[PDB]
Homo-oligomer: A and B are copies of this chain.
Amino acid sequence: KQPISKLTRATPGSAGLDLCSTSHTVLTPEMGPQALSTGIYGPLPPNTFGLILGRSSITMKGLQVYPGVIDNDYTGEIKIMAKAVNNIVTVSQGNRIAQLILLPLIETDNKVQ
């Protein structure tokens, strides 16, 4: 059970923190959205929220990651929501399949329930 602080950036100017699946998973188009396990857990740094986005090299290989919002105070496991677009896609364990982007959480007076 690992916190977001254990994630790494590919390069200094990389916007995203790499996310890997902890399991070998095969996806087919007819399966629809699948939630892939990462072994990485919220919560996020104060005043930030997360966006899970695809890596372009993985998108172009036919695996769509659905953009996912990670709430600031989520303490569960970050999962990647993914779908094989046209073809059979195989994710090997430890392959980098998504990225976590951190963004400022703007305060508003919207009511909270």
Residues of A within 8 A of B (CB): 4-5, 7-17, 29-30, 32-33, 35, 43, 45, 48-51, 53-56, 59-60, 62, 64, 66-74, 81, 83, 85-87, 99, 101-106, 108-113
Contact = CB atoms under 8 A, between A and B. Distances in A.
Contact of A53 (B67, B72, B85, B87): B67
B81 A59 contact: yes
12 contacts: A5-B110, A8-B113, A9-B112, A11-B73, A13-B71, A13-B105, A14-B72, A15-B71, A33-B85, A49-B101, A53-B69, A59-B66
Contacts of A9: 110-113
A102 to B, nearest CB: 5
Nearest to A16: B69
Given A103-B103, A110-B8, A60 B73 contact: no
